[PDB]
Amino acid sequence: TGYDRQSISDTTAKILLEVQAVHFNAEKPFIFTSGWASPVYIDCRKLISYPRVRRALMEMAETTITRDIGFEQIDAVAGGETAGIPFAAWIADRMMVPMQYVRKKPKGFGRNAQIEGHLEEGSRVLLVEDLTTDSRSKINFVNALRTAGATVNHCFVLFHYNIFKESVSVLKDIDVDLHALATWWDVLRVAKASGYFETKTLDEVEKFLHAPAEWSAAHGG
């Protein structure tokens, strides 16, 4: 699958396109429950349904983690509910460490109402999610972990939008480093080189990537 960051980015973008976890539509943009308009759409949940694909992604996740964080810095892996859970389960297995998962909302009240699994005080926990857009929803999960006694300095996702400043800075501002396999820039570059898409389509995707909030406003949102 590749050891270096660049081959992992490439292979991951190719996979996202190969099984159409990524879709483009310049003519009829994707409209989101939040009222965002976009010519791009990704569903990383799709990836769980392809045995060879998910294996490769999990192999590359473990490589990314051990390369950029280390081999013995993580005592447990916690998945964000829901879409982070399958990936957390596989990464936890590969890393031979305890798994937890973190509920979006507490069940009851207490320093532990969002944590499922056993979490030892002092454990260094890696937060795993499928993707990040602007990382705002990660603050909840990081907080639940820290309140429950965990040390959290890293978050891993498969896919990092990398089009909003916030995706890195919201995490850095609460002392968490972001790690990922690929971004929209990797998808765009592979898509271009492939020859499979119309220039009109990729032109629009690129426009969105450079200024997505403005692009949304000019096409709907």
Binding site for Na ion (CB under 5 A): 112, 115
- For residue 83, the minimal CB distance to a second copy (Å) is 7
Smallest separation, CB 102 to a second copy (Å): 11
> DSSP letter string over 92-132?
HHHTT--EEEE-SS-SSSSTTTTEES---TT-EEEEEEEEE
What's the DSSP call for residue 35?
Answer: S
CB 134 within 8 A of CB 157: no
Q: Does residue 22 touch a second copy according to CB under 8 A?
A: no
Based on CB atoms, which residue is closest to a second copy, 106 or 169? 106
60 binds, among a second copy, Na ion, none (CB under 5 to 8 A by kind): none
- Do the annotations mark residue 123 as ligand-binding? no
Which one of a second copy, Na ion, none interacts with residue 85, CB within 5 to 8 A by kind? a second copy
Residue 216 annotated as binding?
Answer: no
Q: How far is the CB of 87 from a second copy (least distance, A)?
A: 8
Does 46 participate in binding a second copy (rule CB under 8 A)?
yes
Per CB under 8 A, the list member of 8, 74, 83, 176 interacting with a second copy is 83
The listed partner (Na ion, a second copy, none) that binds 149, CB under 5 to 8 Å by sort, is none
Alpha helices in 73-211 (DSSP H): 85-94, 138-147, 166-172, 184-194, 199-210
Nearer Cβ to a second copy, position 119 or 178? 119
* 12 appears as a binding residue in the annotation: no
